[PDB]
């Protein structure tokens, strides 16, 4: 009659560890096509009904929301990969899951997982030491300031639809990173706006901030769109004649009183409307719509206004001209105003776009992209995001290691020799760790269409011949040196990946039982 769990499912034993292994393979198998710049993209449909397609492991695992506890640990460690580094969230989960696959036959042989986890901790400790030996300090050495940024951005943009126009896109990509303080570089500070229509090579770089120009209200052919030093005013409240929401009940029996209450509704609005002119600002920006009466009164005094501007764009305006948002039109102070070097409304893409240009106080920028289709430009923007992260980390981190299979093979190469000196179960565990490091160069060839059998075996040949820098060429299929091909990643990525993947692996291998309470 009595029950221990009161109907709360709890399972233990070696079968629970196997169930944790199958969960790590399921998460790995989903991220395998998303590994590498040429890797395939995953189709994810969230319960929010927003269909997204991306290859970035961070965004992928955040939108899946896997309830499985052992599989959720691989998601939590991927968010740590997005925190400590921010790049490589796809490879850290695949490598951690591969450690679960290589530890599966050891569980059937009767080898305890604690000796397996202890073997990885000694393997990573030797692996990080080899990465420090593979860390090459380079700043001005055999490279200039311009060639270091350009030649590294061309490789990230290679094998893409932008390959032919890459010469123009590297110039805007390098100038985008140099437009910000090299001490603190944030990808969020670089704005990117997609412009439908037009040629890809005609894209422009804006030093200031731009937005969509969502103003739908009539009164056009006025309010000149080109200003030299406009005074930008950030507004909150609603200046439209006929208001959005509220109202009032007024009972009057006279005809002159009918026109009076209509003029009263006008005078109450015109009061705060005239206070905008008393500030003497040429640009009026508000997150709420600016009605026909307001845009007409601004047209007579030659004041430009745009309503219903996104909040994300208004925050960049504050970071551009150094202004501030004031709630009312009365108390507006002079320091809340701001000014740019040039203001123009561009018709590029058969659509009107307001832009601020030449802001000396701007901590952010905006880069416009053009193309024949909105989906193609989105691929250009994401291929640019991969190029920005390489250019950004090049200045922030001067210690680099050869990527694209180069470093992955050298770490796996030496640990096979280090395992010869160690005897016992730890020898087969280190050999399994070095074998688990072979999944990274493998999936890079499988996702790009290259043959995994020939290229990997040929890579194991020349790399064993005394040259440590041989990677996998992503352009023309062959083995080659990525140090010459300029495939570069900082040493902190390879160190934090081996530390985070083994950590998440050690947390899952240490779980004998999963207790889930229902309620």
């Amino acid at each position: 009659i009595v029950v221990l769990k009161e109907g709360t499912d709890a399972s233990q034993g070696k079968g629970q560890i196997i169930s944790n292994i199958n969960a790590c393979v399921a998460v790995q198998e989903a991220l395998k096509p998303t590994l590498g710049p040429l890797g395939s993209d995953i189709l994810i449909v969230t319960s929010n009904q927003k269909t997204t397609i991306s290859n970035d492991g961070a965004t992928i695992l955040k939108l899946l929301d896997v309830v499985h506890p052992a599989a959720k640990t691989l998601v939590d460690i991927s968010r740590a990969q997005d925190a400590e580094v921010g790049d490589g969230t796809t490879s850290v989960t695949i490598l951690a899951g591969e450690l679960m696959k290589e530890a599966k036959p050891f569980l059937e042989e009767g080898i305890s997982s604690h000796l397996i986890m202890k073997g990885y901790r000694k393997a990573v400790s030797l692996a990080v030491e080899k990465i420090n030996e593979l860390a090459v300090d380079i700043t001005s050495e055999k490279s200039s300031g311009r060639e270091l940024l350009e030649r590294c951005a061309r490789t990230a943009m290679s094998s893409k639809l932008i390959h032919n126009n890459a010469d123009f896109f590297v110039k805007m990509c390098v100038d985008a990173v140099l437009s910000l303080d090299r001490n603190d570089l944030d990808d969020k500070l670089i704005g990117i706006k997609k412009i439908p229509g037009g040629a890809m090579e005609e894209s422009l770089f804006i030093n200031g901030v731009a937005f969509k120009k969502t103003f739908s209200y009539a009164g056009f052919e006025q309010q000149p769109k080109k200003f030299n030093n406009p005074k930008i005013l950030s507004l909150n409240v609603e200046l439209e004649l006929k208001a959005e929401k509220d109202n009032a009940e007024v009972r009057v029996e006279h005809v002159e009183d009918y026109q009076a209450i209509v003029d009263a509704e006008w005078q109450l609005i015109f009061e705060k409307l005239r206070q905008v002119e008393e500030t003497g600002a040429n640009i009026v920006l508000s997150k709420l719509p600016i009605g026909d009466l307001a845009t007409q009164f601004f047209a007579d005094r030659n004041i430009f206004c745009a309503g219903r501007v996104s909040a994300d764009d208004m925050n960049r305006v504050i970071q551009a001209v150094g202004g501030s948002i004031q709630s009312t039109t009365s108390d507006i102070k002079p320091e809340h105003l701001g000014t740019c070097a040039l203001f123009e409304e561009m018709q590029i893409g058969s659509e009107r776009y307001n832009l601020f240009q030449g802001c000396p106080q701007a901590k952010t920028c905006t880069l416009l992209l053009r193309g024949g289709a909105e989906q193609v430009i989105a691929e250009v923007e994401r291929s640019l995001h991969d190029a920005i992260m390489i250019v950004k980390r090049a200045l922030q981190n001067k210690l680099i290691v050869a990527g694209g299979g180069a470093t992955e093979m050298e770490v796996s190469k030496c640990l096979r020799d280090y395992s010869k000196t160690i005897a016992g179960k730890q020898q087969m565990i280190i050999n399994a760790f070095a074998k688990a490091l072979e999944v990274i160069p493998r999936q890079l060839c499988e996702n790009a269409g290259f043959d995994a059998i020939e290229i990997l075996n040929k890579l194991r040949l020349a790399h064993s011949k005394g040259e440590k820098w041989y990677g996998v060429v992503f352009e023309t299929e062959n083995i080659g040196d990525n140090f010459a091909k300029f495939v570069w990643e900082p040493a902190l990525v390879k160190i934090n990946a081996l530390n985070s993947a083994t950590e998440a692996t050690n947390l899952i291998l240490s779980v004998d039982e999963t207790i889930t309470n229902k309620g």
Binding site: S40, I42, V45, D65, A373
Partner: protein, 158 residues
């Protein structure tokens, strides 16, 4: 601004005549924007197929199977037009090929509208060249995007 005044004996007749006129306005917009024109019905997909099929042997690789299938995929459009017009899709397609090979490379299309011959020139069936280029582009672009997706995960509605 101009206002096109449209009438019809029935609702659907008004909406059909209005959208048919709007379809002509989109053609005139492309004819003025780009003076380059081709005769597009049944002619373009065959000429595109005959040129790629000849160059497929010179490429010598994975592209040879991709270009051969690309020419066969282009042949779907004229065969589909022949199936909608009540003609043999296999017989009409090859008939258009032999006329564009044994004689000369030109625009000879499907008989769908009807004439004494299959020529699209004297029949005055024309499509914008910028319209035919964007049609074969976005079609290939999405085909690469569908093959770009190696995994599909769809959740429920909460």
């Amino acid at each position: 601004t101009v206002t096109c005044f449209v009438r019809g004996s029935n609702k659907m007749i008004v909406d059909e005549a209005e959208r048919a006129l709007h379809d002509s306005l989109c053609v005139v917009r492309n004819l003025v924007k780009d003076s380059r024109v081709v005769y597009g019905g049944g002619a373009a997909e065959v000429t595109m197929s005959l040129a790629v099929s000849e160059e497929a042997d010179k490429q010598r690789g994975i592209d040879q199977y991709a270009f051969r299938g690309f020419a066969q995929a282009l042949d779907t459009i004229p065969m589909t037009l022949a199936e909608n017009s009540g003609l043999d899709p296999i017989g009409t397609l090859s008939t258009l090929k032999s006329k564009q090979l044994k004689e000369k490379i030109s625009n000879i299309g499907v008989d769908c509208l009807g004439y004494g011959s299959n020529d699209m020139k004297e029949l005055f069936v024309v499509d914008p060249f910028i319209g035919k280029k964007q049609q074969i582009l976005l079609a290939t672009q999405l085909c690469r995007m569908i093959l770009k997706i190696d995994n599909v995960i769809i959740s429920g509605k909460d």
